[PDB]
Amino acid sequence: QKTVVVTTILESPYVMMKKNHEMLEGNERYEGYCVDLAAEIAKHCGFKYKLTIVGDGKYGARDADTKIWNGMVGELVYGKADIAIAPLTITLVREEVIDFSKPFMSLGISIMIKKPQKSKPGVFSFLDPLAYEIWMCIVFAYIGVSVVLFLVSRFSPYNEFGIFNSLWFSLGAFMQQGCDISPRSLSGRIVGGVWWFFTLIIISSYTANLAAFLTVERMVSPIESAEDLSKQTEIAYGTLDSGSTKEFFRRSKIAVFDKMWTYMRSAEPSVFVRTTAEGVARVRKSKGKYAYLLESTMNEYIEQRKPCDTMKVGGNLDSKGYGIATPKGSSLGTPVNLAVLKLSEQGVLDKLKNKWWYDKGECGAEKTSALSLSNVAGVFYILVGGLGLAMLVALIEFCYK
Amino acid sequence: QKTVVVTTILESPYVMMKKNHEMLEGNERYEGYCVDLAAEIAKHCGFKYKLTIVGDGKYGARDADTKIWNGMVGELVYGKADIAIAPLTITLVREEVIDFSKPFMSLGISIMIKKPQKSKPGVFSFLDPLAYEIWMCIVFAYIGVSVVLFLVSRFSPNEFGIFNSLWFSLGAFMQQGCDISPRSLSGRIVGGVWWFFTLIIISSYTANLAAFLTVERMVSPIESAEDLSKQTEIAYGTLDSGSTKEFFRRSKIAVFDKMWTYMRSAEPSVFVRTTAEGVARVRKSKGKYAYLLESTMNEYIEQRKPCDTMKVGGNLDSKGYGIATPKGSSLGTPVNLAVLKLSEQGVLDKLKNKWWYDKGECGATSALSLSNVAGVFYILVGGLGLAMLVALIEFCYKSRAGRKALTLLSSVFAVCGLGLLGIAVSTDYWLYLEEGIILPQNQSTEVKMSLHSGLWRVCFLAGEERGRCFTIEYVMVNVLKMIRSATPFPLVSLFFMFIGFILSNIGHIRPHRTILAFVSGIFFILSGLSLVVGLVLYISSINDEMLNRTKDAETYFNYKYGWSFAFAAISFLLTESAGVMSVYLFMKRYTA
Amino acid sequence: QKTVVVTTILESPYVMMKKNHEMLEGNERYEGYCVDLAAEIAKHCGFKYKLTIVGDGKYGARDADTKIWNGMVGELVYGKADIAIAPLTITLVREEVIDFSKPFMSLGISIMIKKPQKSKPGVFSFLDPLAYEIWMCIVFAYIGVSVVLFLVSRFSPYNEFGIFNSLWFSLGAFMQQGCDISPRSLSGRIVGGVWWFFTLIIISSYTANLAAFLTVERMVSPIESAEDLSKQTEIAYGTLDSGSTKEFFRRSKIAVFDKMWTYMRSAEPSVFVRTTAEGVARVRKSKGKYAYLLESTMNEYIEQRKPCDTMKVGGNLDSKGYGIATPKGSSLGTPVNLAVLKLSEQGVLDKLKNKWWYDKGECGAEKTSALSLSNVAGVFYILVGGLGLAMLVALIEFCYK
Amino acid sequence: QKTVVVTTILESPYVMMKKNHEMLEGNERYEGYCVDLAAEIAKHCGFKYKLTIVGDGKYGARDADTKIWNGMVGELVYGKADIAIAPLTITLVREEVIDFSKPFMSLGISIMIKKPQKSKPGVFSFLDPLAYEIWMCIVFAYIGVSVVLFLVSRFSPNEFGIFNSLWFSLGAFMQQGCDISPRSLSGRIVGGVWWFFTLIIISSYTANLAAFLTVERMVSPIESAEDLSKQTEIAYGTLDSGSTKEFFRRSKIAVFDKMWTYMRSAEPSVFVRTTAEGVARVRKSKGKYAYLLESTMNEYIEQRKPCDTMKVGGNLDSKGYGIATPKGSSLGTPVNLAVLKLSEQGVLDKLKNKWWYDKGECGATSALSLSNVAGVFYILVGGLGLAMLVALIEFCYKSRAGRKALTLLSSVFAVCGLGLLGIAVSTDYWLYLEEGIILPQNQSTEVKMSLHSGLWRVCFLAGEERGRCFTIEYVMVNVLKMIRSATPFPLVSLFFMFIGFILSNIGHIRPHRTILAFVSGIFFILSGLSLVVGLVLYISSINDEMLNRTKDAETYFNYKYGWSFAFAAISFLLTESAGVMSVYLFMKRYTA
Ligand code: NA
Ligand code: NA
């Protein structure tokens, strides 16, 4: 009848070279999202098509001097193609020269951080089953029950409870140990037994909350939005050195993306990578201190690669669309536009996206280990620090003995 | 030229009537997203426009018989409108008759759930790993061990009084073992079993609290449609007429086919008929309902007071709102170039932040908190306050300063002790018990059956309000036969108490010998320990049959104790006190 | 062309009367498995059918005196029907007079027990975090460390450790309490500290295993097979008073079903119910002490009703089949036989069974409570029994003082 | 009449050749289910038969081009056979060309998994809630607290020796607090922090053991295809050619469509090509592979030695094996009546129990077991045996029976102590570390990189076997910079030890004054406590970077310590012993 020269670009999962492409020939050399999409457009619009990768290898832009269009846009304007079933972003400068359909895929700028791991434990990590409000109120109560036991014994007599001895009865009461002497007045018996019931609940609450932490691994991200990235300075963030994503933050005006751009423009060292593969490798080799601002479709795809190291957080920052382009004044413009809206409402576009991102995507969708010395290392430090601060006070003691 | 007739629909925050709607006139009667969007398009395309609200109040659909469009799509096809700057979904059946621009807003089907919003701990929530019958019977065990300590020691070859025996049982309970040790083998049996008792109780407290804190960390909130698909404790529903309901019936996606399966067969009806109804059902369900709606409404209602609902997960499909034109218009091409310019100049994100978020009525650690354990501080502050109270009266006792009041308190506690157990075992109020069904609206209860209970006499109440006091000897369950096993121990308790009373009386009538006072002291203690065996049997019989109920989500039981149960608890404290009083003056007869 | 009079019986989920059957009329009065099956047979074999419930209301049997066939078999033999798309069991006596197809549903005799619940706690239920082998070895070791501490102190002297005192040091060491006096020889210091490390592990093992039990509810059934039912006598089991299931155990000869029949024949009271609804209600109102031996298709269906009270355990005891019956010498015999094998291999028969048993089936496919007094009641009993056995030995003591 | 030609296939346990196959001849060459079934059918139908094995060795299928059946279905259509008494599946394409009887065996697709078979606890598995570096550093903390107890007390205004100081730290560690109390405020700081130390350690032991026992109760075995569908840690596969593989590709059932999705895209290939291969992959995977096969093979292989695999769940579909006839035979109707008679007389269940189970090579509590805690009994029996050992030498010491050997042991421990730490910090064996990949077959390892390590000198090894001893000052990670932070504390430990040594020497050269012996005693204890800060920093630096690894299922790390790490541990025990020795003879100089 006539052959239709379609044009796409080499980009996963849209068009990939199949494993046996040196022995296959025709439209069977290539596989991917746009290969399956071109098959669906052809069966609805009724044409025979020839898959053809763009020679220039770009998407399409107009030179500011020669006014000549590069990429897949250039093959439609000048005549080398009949349709571009490809991830072309529907933009203002391209709609003036070629005709887009409705967006078969909606996307935007997203955040790629490294997938969060357990943590490194600090020194006072052993205190974390109880909040700092609790630990300070225990110290306040330990001074509290010792001052009262001093006033219970010295005033209203029955002795052997000084300000140093009342701290020493209540201390072994806390860690459930044995003391030298017991109170013998009923006022002192209340100070004993009620503080005994206090530390019984606190030790049990410490052990039970630590058992919940060691059983259920509940990892969180520091970043859940670009509002979170703007407020912080610990995690660095950047875009690619040339493209629509860096140009988005350059001319943005809202509240946050201006704040994010003044960060990225100023920051030393350079947050701007030069390749997408450089920005993904910089996320993995930064131990969770670099976030790469890129498109949501690549962000969901790289998250389904190996290793399982990157993560998409938050929502999109803008709203773009990928359209199927035809030359202006073409006989394919209207039926392909009606074909995209038919495939969208039937679930075909959702089905092909679940296939090439999740079904054909690796890393789809324990056995508690021993506690390392890192988790309880601060308890050794207070212990030896307690042994060091006891040899000093004994040396302070024989300065006046 | 002429004025372009802009047809829109009344929908918030797209087109809203202003507050001064009656006084102010023209195109200035209206505010919203699409009113600001119509000004941006007319500025770039270069026309003067008039805003009109569609008469039908619909978006647009063709009749299956009449084939006439009824809405904003109808006014474009039939010539009444020149443009529809409106939240109009770009649809296959609509694109055949009108021309859409590129989407000015990308959107889809989302999930609306109620925020968990918290679980608030009370004052004595630290007691919650054990039931209140355990904490009651621990105190009965604490008094019971101490008086047996006093009995076994100061009659034997003292250091142990009841002041020291209450002190040994404290340090053993909170695992201190502070210092005092029973020396005879008979005293060591008391210390032995009370050491094993508190070893189980502290282990049961820690392990049940570890169970509670672990299960609430297993609670995963809904973050996808797969989460709604699996979890069936949250019911989810759609509006009864619209594109969101029609999405699930035709979907050939595995998770979405299962969700329509759940919704088409669910009792009662999960399909609301109004968006305001579906938002209301989210709020009056305490996180047990999830409403599937449009994402732009889900983001807008989340920013309205009350700040109660939230948007979870992503979108379930991808569709867009477009600017629509008569399909033969000379305006459709500059409008299409206008929307793509406003998308790239950030005007559309600026206007969405304005109406959804800037005019939003809302805003925008895993450790144990201090509110979880604030009550054990309150006992501790309360303990130090009570200790300063005794410090006055003990300093007063030494500064200011026999068997007579000791004789008197032994009798008068045994008088009230024999009386309170007697009127408790006779009267029938030992167990309240309600039954019924949970009505869906407001969880309003209806008691299908109340009860009264004694030991050999139950009586029914308001639910079937009959005065028919059924004897347990013959009528008509098994839990009334389980308390028959519990029944003899308060009877033996009253029997040991009476013999201890009459020997306490003739010890006061005839104080000639001494030994009959100690025989009284044995009998009050054995009567109290028989009450502990009785009350633990009585409560354990109830909790076993509360478990054997075939638990349902439409039944409820509200078992309760009464003043007949309470006077038996008072009967314990008085006879164990009169047991301390009886061994006291028996030592005075040896002394004097 | 001609109308086909099909015959079925009123039985869920096979043919049920639809909710609006008084206003609907035709083949739309009825719904169910066999209603959807008759629609699938008609679209493959090409006929128009009339749904007709059997007047007699039975499945079909031959009278031993009149030799006349009842039920749906009788309407095919004498002429009142053209096909019986129904759950008819393919048997020897029916195949001689009518023609069955291949089995569209395979089934057998199964076991219906009540769905297991938590338990009722006994008296020594508090001991259950540790096995009885552990508890006896602790008592052996407590006597062991007390006899050794006696020989450590009396032989090889340094006293205050008799046979009663050495039991008393090791006792408070077990429950982590304070004792009156400590050992003062290095041999006694080893007996102290090593038994101290013993009870530290045992108390921690008790608390941790109890925390695992209270967190993960893992309920089990006493019965997992008919081999389990034969060996026990606690749970009673029976069949219906008349039918194929009772006749199966009557003439069985293998090993176990003869043992099960001698049980059921002898047992008092009667294990044989007279209705299926009586046997299901007897399972629910027996608190897990009655098992009802019935067909696997009703057992899976009643399990998906309300309440969620019954459970199917084990596998099938025999192997039966439900076939679609035609009269002998019929023009529908061969195409319906080829229709059943076509619907089986396409998944239609599996799809209709998932619909009417699981998708149209209710009861498809936490928040830890406080411990009741029932769980720890035996600890109170040993305590008061310890208080009772101490007042007695003190009374034994003053018989020789 | 003629002899009926029975065509069967060689398949166990349906038709098997006997052991005496060479000598015995006729129809008696064969045994099995279908040999017994052919005898039962010929007895009821009344014919004499001859058993033949099919030449092709196939069941039967038509070619897509040639349209010729190749198997037992082929010998029936083409006249070579009169009946096929065989495990022949009743199929739609087969029923068109031959006549099947009713199914003599009902069957389907099942799941074959490996039995868990146990997890066996070792001797010292009770130590496993804490790492062995914790249990090592507890003993270092136990020695460290005791020697500081002795230092702080017997130099001050004794009850405390090192014999009593090791005893106070025992009762505090196992939470007894048996009886002795430090009286001065300086001694109470030692008792204070060691009470808080063991409060965290016992709580960490109990909570981690509660985590372990809870997670292993969360382990649910596979009991359905829905369990295989959800859980992706067990890989499941089919045979590469057969009806079971063709079942999943055409299935429109939601759980079965997802299983084919997992199997069509999985690396490496889950599809085996032989049934014997698929059973083998179940056995060499330790419960990480599940083979989807025929139910009758799954029940038969389960009864074969080794008793290693099991059948879980129910069947995934419903099909049957039938007796097949030429479609124009006068034998098909009595055979159909024969199979229904043998089904009801229990003959078919008798023959299945015979070959599957009666000739089967196999057979056919939730509490903590005594094997989990047997090691703490072994310490306890070991403790009582060690206590009787000291009972001899303490009875010997009293029966038989100064500063000189006390002077000698103080020196010679400080000589070896200064030497062992010196040669440890200099040499580079502090950390072995292996890296590599896990080969699939036999889990055979290959070390891609070994390491040596010191404090300022690492050296590579066999994986890229280079002798290039990289200095840490400049080369080329961060964990080598983390041990740089650890580095000064063994250097200060050696610095405190040398000053303590030379003051110990001139105290022996010049015993004129006394005070320089105690200054020696301070320096050995502070050197040992600096080693505790050093070794805890050194180990915690390693375990933090072991966590930051981006954990994969194809990588493995096998970090290990060496004799350079071990001599620093020995350097602790000797200087803390020489610290006890130094304060001992300083008290002898006061005494004498
Ligand atoms: Na203690
Ligand atoms: Na837990």
Author numbering:
A (entry chain B), C (entry chain D): 392 to 549, 569 to 775, 782 to 817
B (entry chain C), D (entry chain A): 392 to 548, 569 to 775, 784 to 820, 833 to 907, 919 to 1034
Article, verbatim:
Synaptic complexes of α-amino-3-hydroxy-5-methyl-4-isoxazolepropionic acid (AMPA) receptors (AMPARs) with auxiliary subunits mediate most excitatory neurotransmission and can be targeted to treat neuropsychiatric and neurological disorders, including epilepsy. Here we present cryogenic-electron microscopy structures of rat GluA2 AMPAR complexes with inhibitory mouse γ5 and potentiating human cornichon-2 (CNIH2) auxiliary subunits. The core of each complex is a Y-shaped tetrameric AMPAR with a three-layer domain organization. Auxiliary subunits are membrane proteins that associate with and regulate AMPAR trafficking, cellular localization, gating kinetics and pharmacology.
To gain insight into the structural mechanism of PMP inhibition in the presence of γ5 and CNIH2, we supplemented the purified protein with 100 µM ZK and 100 µM PMP and subjected it to cryo-EM. Data processing revealed two populations of particles. The first group produced a 3D reconstruction with density for two γ5 subunits per AMPAR tetramer and yielded a GluA2–γ5ZK-PMP structure, grossly similar to the GluA2–γ5ZK structure published previously. Because of the much higher resolution of GluA2–γ5ZK-PMP compared to GluA2PMP, the positions and orientations of PMP molecules in the GluA2–γ5ZK-PMP binding pockets were determined unambiguously. The pockets are mainly hydrophobic, mostly enclosed within individual GluA2 protomers and contributed by residues P512, S516, F517, D519, P520, Y616, N619, L620, F623 and L624 of one subunit and S615 of the neighboring subunit. Consistent with the critical role of S516, F517, P520, S615 and F623 in PMP binding, alanine substitutions of these residues caused a substantial weakening of the PMP inhibitory potency. The resulting GluA2–γ5–CNIH2ZK-SPD-PMP structure is similar to GluA2–γ5ZK-PMP, except that the latter lacks two CNIH2 subunits and SPD. Crosslinking of C589 cysteines was not observed in the GluA2–γ5ZK-PMP structure or in the absence of PMP (GluA2–γ5–CNIH2ZK-SPD), indicating that CNIH2 and PMP together are the two factors that cause strong deviation of the AMPAR inner pore from the fourfold rotational symmetry, likely due to increased protein flexibility in this region. We identified four PMP binding sites in the ion channel extracellular collar, a hub for regulation of iGluR gating. Given the substantial remodeling of the extracellular collar sites upon channel opening due to kinking of the pore-lining M3 helices, PMP acts as a wedge that binds to these sites in the closed state and prevents channel opening.
